[PDB]
Design a protein around this ligand. Sequence first.
Ligand SMILES: Cc1cc2nc3c(=O)[nH]c(=O)nc-3n(C[C@H](O)[C@H](O)[C@H](O)COP(=O)(O)OP(=O)(O)OC[C@H]3O[C@@H](n4cnc5c(N)ncnc54)[C@H](O)[C@@H]3O)c2cc1C
Ligand SMILES: Cc1cc2nc3c(=O)[nH]c(=O)nc-3n(C[C@H](O)[C@H](O)[C@H](O)COP(=O)(O)OP(=O)(O)OC[C@H]3O[C@@H](n4cnc5c(N)ncnc54)[C@H](O)[C@@H]3O)c2cc1C
Ligand SMILES: Cc1cc2nc3c(=O)[nH]c(=O)nc-3n(C[C@H](O)[C@H](O)[C@H](O)COP(=O)(O)OP(=O)(O)OC[C@H]3O[C@@H](n4cnc5c(N)ncnc54)[C@H](O)[C@@H]3O)c2cc1C
Lengths: 564, 564, 559
Amino acid sequence: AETDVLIVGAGPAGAMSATLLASLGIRSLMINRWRSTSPGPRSHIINQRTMEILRDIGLEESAKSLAVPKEYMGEHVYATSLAGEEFGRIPAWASHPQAHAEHELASPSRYCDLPQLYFEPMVVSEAALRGADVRFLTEYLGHVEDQDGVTARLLDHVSGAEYEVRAKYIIGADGAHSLVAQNAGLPFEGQMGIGDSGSINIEFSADLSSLCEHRKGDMYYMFVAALRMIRPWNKWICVWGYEITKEEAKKIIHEIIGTDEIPVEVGPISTWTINQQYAVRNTSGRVFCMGDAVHRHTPMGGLGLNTSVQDAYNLAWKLALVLKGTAAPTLLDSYDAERSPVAKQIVERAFKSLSTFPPVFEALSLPPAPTESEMAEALVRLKDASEEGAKRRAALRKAMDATIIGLGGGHGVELNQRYVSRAVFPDGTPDPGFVRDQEFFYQASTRPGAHLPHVWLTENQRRISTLDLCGKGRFTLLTGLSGAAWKHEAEQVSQSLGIELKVCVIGPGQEFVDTYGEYAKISEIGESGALLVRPDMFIAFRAKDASREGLEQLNVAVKSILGR
Amino acid sequence: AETDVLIVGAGPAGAMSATLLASLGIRSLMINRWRSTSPGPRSHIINQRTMEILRDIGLEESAKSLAVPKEYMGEHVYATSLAGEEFGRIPAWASHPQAHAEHELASPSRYCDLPQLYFEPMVVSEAALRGADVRFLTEYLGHVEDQDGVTARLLDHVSGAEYEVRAKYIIGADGAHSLVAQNAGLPFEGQMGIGDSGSINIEFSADLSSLCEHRKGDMYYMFVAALRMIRPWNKWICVWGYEITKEEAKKIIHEIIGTDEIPVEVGPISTWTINQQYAVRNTSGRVFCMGDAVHRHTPMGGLGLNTSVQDAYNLAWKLALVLKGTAAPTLLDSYDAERSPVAKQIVERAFKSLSTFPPVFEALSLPPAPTESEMAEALVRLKDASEEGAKRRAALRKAMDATIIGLGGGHGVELNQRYVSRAVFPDGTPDPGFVRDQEFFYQASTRPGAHLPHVWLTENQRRISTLDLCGKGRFTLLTGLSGAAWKHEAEQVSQSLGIELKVCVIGPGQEFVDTYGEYAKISEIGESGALLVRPDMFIAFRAKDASREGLEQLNVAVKSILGR
Amino acid sequence: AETDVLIVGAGPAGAMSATLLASLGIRSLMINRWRSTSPGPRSHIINQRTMEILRDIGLEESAKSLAVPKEYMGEHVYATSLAGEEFGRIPAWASHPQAHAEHELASPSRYCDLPQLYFEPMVVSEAALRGADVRFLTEYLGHVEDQDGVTARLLDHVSGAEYEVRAKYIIGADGAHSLVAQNAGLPFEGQMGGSINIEFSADLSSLCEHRKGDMYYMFVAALRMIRPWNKWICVWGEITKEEAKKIIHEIIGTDEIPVEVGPISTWTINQQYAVRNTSGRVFCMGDAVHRHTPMGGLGLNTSVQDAYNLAWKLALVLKGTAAPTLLDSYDAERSPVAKQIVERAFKSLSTFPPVFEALSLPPAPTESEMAEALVRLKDASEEGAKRRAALRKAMDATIIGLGGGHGVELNQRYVSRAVFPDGTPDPGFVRDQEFFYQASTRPGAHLPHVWLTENQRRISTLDLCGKGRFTLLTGLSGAAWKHEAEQVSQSLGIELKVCVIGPGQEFVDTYGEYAKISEIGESGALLVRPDMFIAFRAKDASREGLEQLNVAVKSILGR
Ligand SMILES: Cc1cc2nc3c(=O)[nH]c(=O)nc-3n(C[C@H](O)[C@H](O)[C@H](O)COP(=O)(O)OP(=O)(O)OC[C@H]3O[C@@H](n4cnc5c(N)ncnc54)[C@H](O)[C@@H]3O)c2cc1C
Ligand SMILES: Cc1cc2nc3c(=O)[nH]c(=O)nc-3n(C[C@H](O)[C@H](O)[C@H](O)COP(=O)(O)OP(=O)(O)OC[C@H]3O[C@@H](n4cnc5c(N)ncnc54)[C@H](O)[C@@H]3O)c2cc1C
Ligand SMILES: Cc1cc2nc3c(=O)[nH]c(=O)nc-3n(C[C@H](O)[C@H](O)[C@H](O)COP(=O)(O)OP(=O)(O)OC[C@H]3O[C@@H](n4cnc5c(N)ncnc54)[C@H](O)[C@@H]3O)c2cc1C
């Protein structure tokens, strides 16, 4: 067997890698050890960046059809049981109107709930239909790198046969115990969170619409076990901290529903164990790891799947340009530089969220483990008509509010990627800062290294996002009428370098129109300046004006970005 | 390699076979020669029976989310071009209110438009997630039957390796040139339709919502080329009768749109060639063929995919009962008996529809091939203010009306399955007839051999169909309060035979309630009578009353149905 | 004071009369004794004919905004209480798919639920905004007819003043104790044959949303939706205390939804119909000429249709384009509708009693008697079967009064001087004419609905017509009709629009459903009154066919 890229792993990072490469005409073989995509929905939260990627490759409309919308997600209930009395609620998944506005402003896409159970086959299917070879029941066993490519050895769980694959690169998308990361010898750090422990996950079916429809929520937390909607509102899952459990789980569930009179049907029961670590480096020679393979962490914030897919989006177009000989192999160095700091920041963030929960119990004057008599008292203490009862209600409210960082509040974490690499050609301006907390709030930036900011233009008097002008596996140059020279400069650069760069001259009477003036407003530069946008939506070059010197630079920057 | 059932082919008949078997705990391996599910949407019409199957295995809600609804499908336009003047319209896909009522009455499910492009991965994915092994890039080469099973030889298009699979049965779901049907030596009949010829199919993208949204339709026919919505209303395909075609197709398209000012983007271009035949027998020893493998025909009526899936639904539960030793292998004889007559009837029906089109041209006083001057005159002749112009307008209207048999009018064809086999235990009543034309109109029947009729009951004051009580890979017995004895008779029969049969006693204060009285009305028998329903929704046994003799029979009928 | 038409009464028949007359440029003065439109919800069902009238004067979209749509309306529950066990359901208001199809086929409009409480001000408002003078707190006291008009005496409940109004005609829209009908001396018949109504508020959505119904009958008190699902009224067949809340809790079968008891009012019908609706210059309509049970909700709907029949006639006569003989048709056509609806509404009362007999229940049941019958019904016996079937049969038969009388609603058949007969015999109803609408293009019938297109958009044959004028429908081969209609129009001084339906025309028979429903050649014509009724039908465009249009119009107009 021979391919250009062997993709070990078929979860979110692998499938997306296969889909993007195929889209770019790169031959790839993607392998999974197991029979199917993943039996249970491990991750459900889809952030804006993932939706943006889905939009760019034309899969957002399917993702949207399938997924529960944002409006359903908002009501996060803390309570004793589902049918019991609430302690309080918090506006999760950006459902507070101010959060929602900040959310809407940051992207054309929105939060939805879409379980991995559904997300994966949707992407594996599209990988297959696009150029990509896909082969499950096939186990990566190891590989040996030489100067020209790699040779992987595979074990075929249908035939019993074993075989080799020759490839130019290997992507290690092989999950939380990446054998590909071991064999490439990737250093890992931040091993210690607390003592290693995970969770237990029980799927079930029951029609609790009568308890959910007035107060629609992605999750309901009981003091700590979580009830998470899989479909609204009949498919569910109970999660709690941590182990063999029988069809007694069915009592636990009843007690988590606070009532034993909805018919329940207990599905599968799985345990999730996490050792929290991030790879210091994600690349070794011809090997590139991504997804859980380089960042292993708590589910808090649901950053994993989303960061996993973004790893794939960073790498794909880079592999493709190198494979085609339009970019030097040095281009592949910026994968580690851009995407390695994201791996540490998200493991650290996901862990830090866990510490926002104890204060909820403290507010309740509760120990880490509480007797029901203990918990029943805390509820009484909470309806106390005294100033001490006030202080207490306020303390609980403050404690609850603080958990939001892990439940839709980390907009800054989701969006604020800053890239420093050879891939990103610096424009000479200093880094401006975040005016506000950079974990809670997205700050739009057009400085090289930042994601292209969203704003609405029109095409045929119809709204189109600045993002929809870009991507599609190519470089795009955005300017305005006074920067007409960019067209020509971009033509000469594209001929000489054998690369595709589309230029869009936004303005009145043009194909794309700055009809709300929001482009002029967000660009940070004169009408005649230009922004150059990577196939992965990131700005790699910024021009203040169309002046000759400004025009001359474009070539220097592209060459530099390509390693040429 | 070893499996119980080798499934050659991964299209609609194979995937559905794999999904159902897996659901029944039967080990299966399903193989496809190619990289992906199918690149283009060959078949889009999903009839009620398919929707019913999707409902029973819990995939209807996904099918529905993904698919264009019935209301969109109705407006069938005949015209010169999309932007030109209509000749007339017909209420396609049962959009006439009387058609719609007949439609709604016949099933809990409804027509939708869902291209194969989407349908296939949805089912292949669910097969995989359920027990089934699935392996693409693997070619069936032949097999040799012996007394105990079969040995297939496979060619692996990734490894280059070749290998054997041992299986107890083989399903030949391998399409219009089934190698499995050749090797099993299946006789084929009705070879001659006319001279063998097919069609050319051009995918394209364009935003013709401005020409489609006021008059929403599944297809637009131009005098004969068809414009078919893939997604509304921006993805499309042109089909005409028939050959290399370049990016000139793009002119053809413009002329089929009647205008050259919507931006068009020309996708893939494929040719469909059909030799119309049906297999006289679908079974030979341990081999069972289904789908296009046993019925090859015109798309008129879109019966293929739907009949293909129904073939799978007939067989699966039968294989499973035999594989488990609860049924004799004789049980497998009724596959040919029930499903072979469906194969001939649908090839013949699909062909016969083609002859409803010429009279449209005759009404137009048009030759088989017409010069534009010829066609432009016919339009003039049609606005003529004379009695001869009247006769002409009426003739065209009559001609157009008659095409409906192939565009949603064949409800009888879709639903009127009648089964005679060992599987179906006859109750002694004669065959009642169809009061109305049996190709246009569904006639509900509870006589053994017919599909269980749909009507609404309630469960928790919520509507539930008689169909939702049944299926799930088991036998179900429906009766009423006065037939309480059925419970016990069914218990004794199920113990002694080692089989699952669920009994539902419908009535007031019961789990399921005949709240509209529609069950009493549709059942054709006293409250105390029983209907026994196969896992495939077909009635196999009918009891007039709970009398001892009536009660004694149940055992005789089940034994007989199982071959025991 | 002076006006052309004094409209006594401001309910549905009066307001609609004022609105239509104003629309036709006729001066009218509509009065009403009371402060407001009516406080009570009263009649709620709006049938297709009323909806079509609302469509024609451009008020359907507003009617549809206010109203509960048909899809809410279908689940008719019979039960012990709202929160108790159902006996069964029936598909009310044409919710059975076959009923629904028959319904949808008969008209562009559909059943909705819109309480009088809302319907009335919407129409009184539109009367006022269109030419009409409207004056509440003003009581008709009597009148005296002479040769040239009438003089009504009015009592003004604001000023205390009393005053005279001179008018050409008087419409007696003054309700179930018409003083206008008494003074005109209208004979009444069918004097051969009261309810209490309690409004309340309560959020019973938890009991109603999975089973969406216009009404819930308890065994016999009715729960009726005012707004879904927090507004309610309890009806059954005298004083009441605040104990009324107690009755309501037991009708809800539970006392745990907060309830808020609104007004409490009694309805006391005396069932009669007027043999004649017209005397000299007086014309009565609405409850004034047909008084009956609510069964079928035909009253309001028939009331408005009375107004639609008369208005364009008064207008034509008032303008001198029609002889006063044209007014004679109003009794000829509307009076048989008045008897047929009183008789129908009463006959529906007979269906309910069997439902008890199926239950082996006395007319007045005790809670134990009625607890036994529910046991008797879950019995696992052949005699339990016969009984569950007897109850189902009994329940099914009530549907004639709950959406099943489509024939009653639509099957109007006018014979009179305002309908020019075409020589064909009356064809019959192939099916029961109380349950099933039968479309007809024979003169005397309502113009049948089918869809044409205009700009490739669906438009009903009805939308081509009306608008207070005569319309002539034909096809391309009947092009001569346009000229014949112009000559006739000029000579008679009366507007008649001609529509030549066909390919390349303004209106197109795009589905061929016109050719199919018309009953005549492409070159034939149908002439449609301002009230949607066919008054003339020609088979083809022959000279004799053409020459007859003028005879028919002259004849219709009385000239
Ligand atoms: C039970 C469970 C529950 C979870 N719940 C949540 C949650 O509630 N919220 C949340 O945010 N996150 C959750 N996660 C985390 C989530 O699954 C990860 O973020 C995500 O699946 C990792 O993406 P990935 O594609 O990098 O890795 P994976 O999705 O694990 O993909 C790795 C792939 O590589 C394949 N593979 C592994 N080894 C080999 C080999 N030797 N040869 C060939 N193929 C191989 C595997 O079969 C797999 O298909 C959960 C994970 C699990 C297991
Ligand atoms: C281009 C095209 C357009 C069409 N358009 C329409 C339309 O507009 N309307 C309509 O009603 N119908 C249409 N059809 C018909 C429709 O495709 C069939 O009804 C349906 O796909 C057949 O179902 P099936 O699963 O039995 O066969 P298929 O879907 O053909 O499945 C057969 C499978 O077996 C596999 N296979 C074949 N040989 C081997 C082998 N030796 N080893 C292993 N695997 C093998 C194939 O890869 C394939 O996956 C179209 C068909 C085509 C090809
Ligand atoms: C309490 C009640 C409940 C009802 N419930 C239902 C129901 O549930 N379902 C149903 O189908 N039908 C019901 N009806 C019937 C419905 O109200 C009638 O069909 C409808 O109101 C009659 O329309 P109308 O305009 O002809 O009469 P009305 O609506 O009574 O209009 C007559 C108008 O004339 C005015 N008037 C009377 N006398 C004089 C005078 N001397 N001077 C000036 N003005 C005068 C009155 O104020 C009134 O506004 C109910 C009627 C009542 C009274």
